[PDB]
Structure 1
Amino acid sequence: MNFYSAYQHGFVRVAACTHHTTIGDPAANAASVLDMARACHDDGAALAVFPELTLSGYSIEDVLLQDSLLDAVEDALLDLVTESADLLPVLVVGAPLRHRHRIYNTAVVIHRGAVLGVVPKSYLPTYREFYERRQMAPGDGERGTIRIGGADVAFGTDLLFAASDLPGFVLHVEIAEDMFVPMPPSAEAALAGATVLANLSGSPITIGRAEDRRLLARSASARCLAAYVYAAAGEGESTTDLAWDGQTMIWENGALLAESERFPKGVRRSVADVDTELLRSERLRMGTFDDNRRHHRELTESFRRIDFALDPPAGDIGLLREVERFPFVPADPQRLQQDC
């Protein structure tokens, strides 16, 4: 084996991307997404998560209901897919999509020129600064397929994207408010076998909301013994009534793997190497995890596995991870004081 290949030791490179929203301009959002994704490709990442409703902008309210906007989103999405034929990572791109009667707040999971699936937001907030049920429809319980670019692809809150050559890498996709409810789609999905939990979030920034973002993302990564990839909306979202900080972060089992500048000027990424084997092991030893899955067997066998072959770079790409010299002696002095 190539001893210096991070992937061949169980690692998987993941990126949480915040892009340049151009509210109402889907082609201009897809341009920014394509550029950041090509960067992720150069970095050798396998996964790249963008913010909620990437292709249209989260803040555009009833402009979501205009046929020209929806059509431009579909065209930009098909453009993205076709460009993804030369891209290593799995792209997770937000979009307002047309299904049956309404438009759903979806994440399109795109890979190697194809749409693996389309996940709808499950819990649409309609309170305080949020008015989401006006324009969009909940997906909780929506299964089946959706037709996107002359193809029937998987659609629903019950998906898992398992890498056929990386048995540790199983991706699940929720959206914003999803992880804030007492029983988030991601927890069920984790019991069902999900190891990397992605979250696209629009998230207008507010005093203390970054603290909540971190609390819940970290606790999810801890409880679900998984990696959590978070990406929020940044510069470009309509400042009619809200502001946007563009926070991105990558958690692993309660441990902050990476995060980006808040309130940036320009796009940002958080790229890290997730040790899938560490999760595999924490789960092999914590029987009560499997015990919990079994207690909810019906909820957890109803997930659909979408198989894809990632084929990662097999050479030296470093290790974007802080391996401490002293596993028993933390190098941060305040933590070492508490430990002692």
Structure 2
Amino acid sequence: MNFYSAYQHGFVRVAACTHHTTIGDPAANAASVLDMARACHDDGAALAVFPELTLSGYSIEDVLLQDSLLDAVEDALLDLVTESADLLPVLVVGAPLRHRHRIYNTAVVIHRGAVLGVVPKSYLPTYREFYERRQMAPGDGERGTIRIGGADVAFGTDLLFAASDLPGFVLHVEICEDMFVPMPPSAEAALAGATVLANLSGSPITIGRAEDRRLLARSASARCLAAYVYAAAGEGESTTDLAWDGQTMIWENGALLAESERFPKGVRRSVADVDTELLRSERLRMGTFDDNRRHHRELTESFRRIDFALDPPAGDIGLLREVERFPFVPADPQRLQQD
């Protein structure tokens, strides 16, 4: 055995990335994504989540409907997919994609030269500063496949991406607003077996919103005994009516593993080692969790499980995790006072 290998001890290294948006320029966005993903690769990450609508920019409104923009997004996506043949992590990249009659607000799950799945956002906010239903169709209840670069790949809200050589790591993906409704796709996903829940977010920033995002990502990670990996848009998005803060964060069962500088100059990543055994153990013990699943048996057995082989690095890559010396004695004085 290799005793100093985080992977050999049931950790999976995950990254939430905020790239440099160049609105309406998918080649540029892809290039920023590719450069960030190569960093993640170098870090031995298994997973790299990007902001909502990465390849186009979230904030471009009716420019999303322009043939040239949609065409350029496809072209760029196929280049990423080809570049990914050499990248270790699963990439989750946002893209407006044509399917059937409309464009869907999707997250493309990319791995080692192939698209594993395409996941459409389920709930499209059309209120206050949000106009998503104007340009894009709702994903809830879409199944089937979508044709991307001459292959048919699973399409829908019901997908799970399971590492065949790392069974603690089962990915589900949702998008921004999805985690804000009473019954988020990710909650059914966790009952079905998802352990790492990704969220690609656009999320223009307002007073108090960062708290809202935390409240909902944290509670989700706790109620679903899961890692929650979250990435919002930042510099480059249009400031015609909104500002953007680039927040990224990674939660695990209610605990913050990592977050990044708000309003950064330049791109930022949150990278952390998620303990899949911790999630495994919590779930093994909390039988009411499996009880919830059995109660929603129909909902939860209908997930399609797409397999991939991660083949993570076997050597010493450190441990990107804060392990406290005294599990019973919190180092933070305010927390210790409370206990």
TM-score, normalising length: structure 1:
1.00
Mapped partners of 2:216, 2:328: distance in 1: 27
Once the two structures are TM-superposed, the CA of residue 83 in structure 1 deviates from its matched residue by 0.2
Mapped partners of 2:17, 2:26: distance in 1: 17
Once the two structures are TM-superposed, the CA of residue 52 in structure 1 deviates from its matched residue by 0.1
Once the two structures are TM-superposed, the CA of residue 281 in structure 1 deviates from its matched residue by 0.2
Q: Deviations over 1:276-330 (max 9, x none)?
A: 0000000000000000000000000000000000000000000000000000000
Once the two structures are TM-superposed, the CA of residue 239 in structure 1 deviates from its matched residue by 0.2
Mapped partners of 1:37, 1:323: distance in 2: 26
Once the two structures are TM-superposed, the CA of residue 241 in structure 1 deviates from its matched residue by 0.1
Mapped partners of 1:66, 1:334: distance in 2: 53
Mapped partners of 1:322, 1:246: distance in 2: 23
Q: Deviations over 1:179-206 (max 9, x none)?
A: 0000000000000000000000000000
Q: Which residue of structure 2 lines up, in the alignment, with residue 178 of structure 1?
A: 178
Q: Which residue of structure 2 lines up, in the alignment, with residue 163 of structure 1?
A: 163
Mapped partners of 1:204, 1:12: distance in 2: 30
Q: Deviations over 1:16-43 (max 9, x none)?
A: 0000000000000000000000000000
Local SS of the residue matching 1:266: coil
Mapped partners of 1:59, 1:291: distance in 2: 41
Q: Deviations over 1:82-125 (max 9, x none)?
A: 00000000000000000000000000000000000000000000
Local SS of the residue matching 2:8: helix
Mapped partners of 2:263, 2:64: distance in 1: 26
Local SS of the residue matching 1:147: strand
Once the two structures are TM-superposed, the CA of residue 252 in structure 1 deviates from its matched residue by 0.2
Local SS of the residue matching 2:143: coil
Mapped partners of 2:136, 2:324: distance in 1: 46
Mapped partners of 2:96, 2:208: distance in 1: 28
What RMSD over aligned residues (CA atoms) do the two structures have, in Å? 0.2
Once the two structures are TM-superposed, the CA of residue 53 in structure 1 deviates from its matched residue by 0.1
Local SS of the residue matching 1:283: helix
Once the two structures are TM-superposed, the CA of residue 9 in structure 1 deviates from its matched residue by 0.2
Q: Which residue of structure 2 lines up, in the alignment, with residue 282 of structure 1?
A: 282
Sequence identity percentage: 100
Mapped partners of 1:305, 1:110: distance in 2: 15
Once the two structures are TM-superposed, the CA of residue 334 in structure 1 deviates from its matched residue by 0.3
Q: Deviations over 1:194-226 (max 9, x none)?
A: 000000000000000000000000000000000
Local SS of the residue matching 1:9: coil
Local SS of the residue matching 1:7: coil
Q: Deviations over 1:44-68 (max 9, x none)?
A: 0000000000000000000000000
Q: Give ranges in structure 2 of 5+ residues lacking alignment.
A: none
Tell me if 1:321 matches 2:321: yes
Mapped partners of 1:193, 1:91: distance in 2: 20
Mapped partners of 2:279, 2:63: distance in 1: 42
Q: Which residue of structure 1 lines up, in the alignment, with residue 196 of structure 2?
A: 196
Once the two structures are TM-superposed, the CA of residue 145 in structure 1 deviates from its matched residue by 0.1
Mapped partners of 2:26, 2:324: distance in 1: 43
Mapped partners of 1:50, 1:141: distance in 2: 24
Mapped partners of 2:190, 2:300: distance in 1: 9
Q: Deviations over 1:233-276 (max 9, x none)?
A: 00000000000000000000000000000000000000000000
Local SS of the residue matching 1:256: strand
Mapped partners of 1:119, 1:8: distance in 2: 30
Mapped partners of 1:104, 1:265: distance in 2: 30
Give the count of matched residue pairs: 339
Q: Which residue of structure 1 lines up, in the alignment, with residue 205 of structure 2?
A: 205
Q: Give ranges in structure 1 of 5+ residues lacking alignment.
A: none
Mapped partners of 1:14, 1:82: distance in 2: 21
Mapped partners of 1:86, 1:249: distance in 2: 26
Mapped partners of 1:286, 1:262: distance in 2: 35
